[PDB]
């Protein structure tokens, strides 16, 4: 009879218990306390403007229909017991396709104390929308939100709250960062209100702030363009009689930039405006294209006014490298102070 | 108190027959729809479909679910929807749709004292619309969503938009990366199949594409390559090997863009706007390579006459390509 004592208690609670009605129906507002444990902040899918996150979604409310006086004080029960009682129908407003893991069993936890206070956590994987303004790409930052609330109960019936001070009510595991190109700088925890065609609902919101790491784009995009620009400006120092040589320099380098200009569109998501990377590519396209133009002008004046042709060729050894140096300093100081 | 509410709800479901629609054997049951579009994303040209997320609301009156003495709107648990009659509304032009189930099955049942029922779902669907890409990307589309009753004909069920033209809300808060929603419309009509006439509601958007993206990706890369071929006409032909050996590389480079532009769009047996421009730019860079070979062929036979051609090439080629853009943009806008 070590367990039949608890079997009588459990059968006593569920006897005459209707799970279709929230606690305190028509008498007060059911109050739910929530807190999250981010076990791993997953990758951010830039081309879909989303991200992934795995949480220990914890909830807690109070139901007076589940009071008992047993040998123990807390009943750590099976996950099956959850479906026998009323639980909040919390959902994520901006989620896209979430997963409630149930391997090898439904990853849920239910505990009942002697005063009716319930604790009900679960393990979730959430894919949430994150709008992104890629105007400052690849030096952009973002504030990806995560909003959750009740689906069927208005704020006159069910209200949500944070378990502790809101800053400490969402915790991130130290080693959970699965991010590759971003860098989670911190989060802010807030609460709000929404109004729909059915009524007003309480919404609990969490914002995660990310900053992109531009290290990957320095090596694949920015460095090849700089080398191509420097490669083209080699053509100035060649003697004027190497007409086939400089022509190969001028034509080929501009073709290389077109290759690079298209090759940047792969990692780049499709957006209407022009990112900060395209300005660097566009200007680097003009510089190499101007070098080809300058040679033709020098070649044109040859055999007619050679002194003028040599006069211009000296300047292009100065203006082109110096202007490209001035352009880089403005570009790399404008966007790093944002 | 709360026990009395349990008794009232329990009595309603005692003897309730889920197999029979309300007013069975009598007048048809009227059902009103409300859609609250949450987001539209992934308007795919290759698959010719789009993804839609929305809050689908249905309104109907079942006299068997009327209670008295409780001045409230009973918002019951979403699991009680398995013990009631609900319309068999389906989406005809949907390919793969699902109802979100986190943390529970997103669903709402909300009774009213007079028997009215409000039934809400949060549905994400991938409905299919056929796209006419003849003027791509300077094109407009008309992607629809067909709402229909499967097993009930107009003698048993009737659909109507609840609130008239205010039934669908939230369209104006949608920011498609490439498209821009111009207009949405609501239609109610009947469709006749081999098994009877069924009611149908329709929702359609008229998307218009944004050209600003293809300027940086297709036209500007193509135009600049065309300009490069013209630079060959200001270079003296003394570089006998260079001009021909680089004109060929420009033509080669042009085809590379075309190769990576057929991957962007599906396989269709006609010529779009983007193909005409690429073909047009291909001809101009093709003539330039053909032009130099003619000059290089007689670079020594008649050098005085060969140099005269390059004088006109400096003018005829730039002017003709300006004519081509004149005709092209006027016809397609």
């Amino acid at each position, epitope marked *: 009879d070590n367990t039949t004592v608890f079997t009588r208690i459990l059968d006593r609670l569920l006897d005459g218990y209707d799970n279709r009605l929230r606690p305190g129906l028509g008498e007060r507002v059911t109050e739910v306390k929530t807190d999250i444990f981010v076990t791993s902040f997953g990758p951010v899918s830039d081309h879909d403007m989303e991200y992934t996150i795995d949480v220990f979604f914890r909830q807690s409310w109070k139901d007076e229909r589940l009071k008992f006086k047993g040998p123990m004080t807390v009943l750590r029960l099976n996950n099956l017991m959850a479906s026998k009682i009323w639980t909040p129908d919390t959902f994520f*407003h901006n989620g896209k396709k979430s997963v409630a893991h149930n391997m090898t069993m439904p990853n849920k936890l239910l505990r009942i104390t002697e005063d009716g206070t319930l604790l009900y956590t679960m393990r979730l994987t959430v894919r949430a929308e994150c709008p992104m303004h890629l105007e400052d790409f690849p030096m952009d930052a973002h504030a990806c939100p995560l909003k959750f609330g009740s689906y069927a109960y208005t704020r006159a019936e069910v209200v949500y709250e944070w378990t502790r001070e809101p800053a400490r009510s969402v915790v991130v595991a130290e080693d959970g960062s699965r991010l590759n190109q971003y860098d989670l700088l*911190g989060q802010t925890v807030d609460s709000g209100i929404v109004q729909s065609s059915t009524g007003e609902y309480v919404v609990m919101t969490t914002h995660f702030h990310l900053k992109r790491k531009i290290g990957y784009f320095v090596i694949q995009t920015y460095l090849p363009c700089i080398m191509t620009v420097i490669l083209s400006q080699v053509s100035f120092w060649l003697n004027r009689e190497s007409v086939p040589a400089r022509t190969v320099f001028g034509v080929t380098t501009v073709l290389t930039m077109t290759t690079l200009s298209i090759s940047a569109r792969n990692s780049l998501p499709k957006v209407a405006y022009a990112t900060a990377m395209d300005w660097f590519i566009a200007v680097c396209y003009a510089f190499v294209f101007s070098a080809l133009i300058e040679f033709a002008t020098v070649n044109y004046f040859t055999k007619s006014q050679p002194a003028r042709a040599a006069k211009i060729d000296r300047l292009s050894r100065i203006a082109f490298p110096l202007l490209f140096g001035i352009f880089n300093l403005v570009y790399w100081a404008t966007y790093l102070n944002r | 108190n709360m026990s009395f509410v349990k008794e009232t709800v329990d009595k309603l479901l005692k003897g309730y027959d889920i197999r029979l629609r309300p007013d069975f054997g009598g007048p048809p049951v009227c059902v009103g729809m409300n859609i609250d579009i949450a987001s539209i994303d992934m308007v795919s040209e290759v698959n010719m479909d789009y993804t839609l997320t929305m809050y689908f609301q249905q309104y109907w009156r079942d006299k068997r679910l009327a209670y008295s003495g409780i001045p409230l709107n009973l918002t019951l648990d979403n699991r009680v929807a398995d013990q009631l009659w609900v319309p068999d509304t389906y989406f005809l032009n949907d390919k793969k749709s699902f109802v979100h189930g986190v943390t529970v099955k997103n669903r709402m049942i909300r009774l009213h004292p007079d028997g009215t029922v409000l039934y809400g779902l949060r549905i994400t669907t991938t409905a299919a619309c056929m796209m006419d890409l003849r003027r791509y990307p300077l094109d407009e589309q008309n992607c629809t969503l067909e709402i229909e009753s499967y097993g009930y004909t107009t003698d048993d069920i009737e659909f109507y938009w609840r609130g008239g033209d205010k039934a669908v809300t939230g369209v104006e808060r949608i920011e498609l990366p490439q498209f821009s929603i111009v207009e949405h419309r609501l239609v109610s009509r009947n469709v006749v199949f081999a098994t009877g006439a069924y009611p149908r509601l329709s929702l359609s958007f008229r998307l218009k594409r944004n050209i600003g993206y293809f300027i940086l990706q297709t036209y500007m890369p193509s135009i600049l390559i065309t300009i490069l071929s013209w630079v060959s006409f200001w270079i003296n032909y003394d570089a006998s090997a260079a001009r021909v050996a680089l004109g060929i590389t420009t033509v080669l480079t042009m085809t590379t863009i075309n190769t990576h532009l057929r991957e962007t769009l599906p396989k269709i047996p006609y010529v779009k706007a983007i193909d005409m421009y690429l073909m047009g730019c291909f001809v101009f860079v093709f003539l330039a390579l053909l032009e130099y070979a003619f000059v290089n062929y007689i670079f020594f036979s008649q050098p005085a006459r060969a140099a005269a051609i390059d004088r006109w090439s400096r003018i005829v080629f730039p002017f003709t390509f300006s004519l081509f853009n004149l005709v092209y943009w006027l016809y397609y806008v």
Partner: nanobody, 123 residues
Framework: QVQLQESGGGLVQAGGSLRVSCAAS????????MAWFRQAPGKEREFLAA???????YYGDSVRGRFTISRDYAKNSVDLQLDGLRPEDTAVYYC?????????????????WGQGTQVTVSS
């Protein structure tokens, strides 16, 4: 050029409604957060309300339950309904739009700022 022009406001006597609007121009702020900031005379700039793309309404810890924020996404504007005004509400009201980086309640997270509107409440 993006300009946030604000209208409405004025002088009211110890209560009564006073609706303040803010019409944006030069950019589509559908994807941004549009907020309202109040700068009391000499004290500091304070947060009042905000509303993101999802129509989630945030309010300050003080003016909650008194002011109502509402956005008209089609016309690219955000209003603010002031009700039950107290004499200590007299200040300059500002209109802001931003992405809410490092918190949406922080004045430093809004790139675009309005020019201010004067509201005076007399006993």
């Amino acid at each position: 050029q993006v300009q946030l022009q604000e209208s409405g406001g004025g002088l009211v006597q110890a209560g009564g409604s006073l609706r303040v609007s803010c019409a944006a121009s030069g950019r589509t702020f559908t994807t941004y957060i549009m907020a309202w900031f109040r700068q009391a005379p000499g004290k500091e700039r304070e947060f009042l309300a905000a509303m993101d793309q999802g129509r989630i309404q945030y309010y300050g810890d003080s003016v909650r339950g008194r002011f109502t924020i509402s956005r008209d996404y089609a016309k690219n504007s955000v209003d603010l309904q002031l009700d039950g005004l107290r004499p200590e509400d007299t200040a300059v009201y500002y209109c802001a739009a931003g992405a809410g980086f490092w918190g949406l309640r922080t004045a430093s997270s809004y790139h675009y700022w309005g020019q201010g509107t004067q509201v005076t409440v007399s006993s």
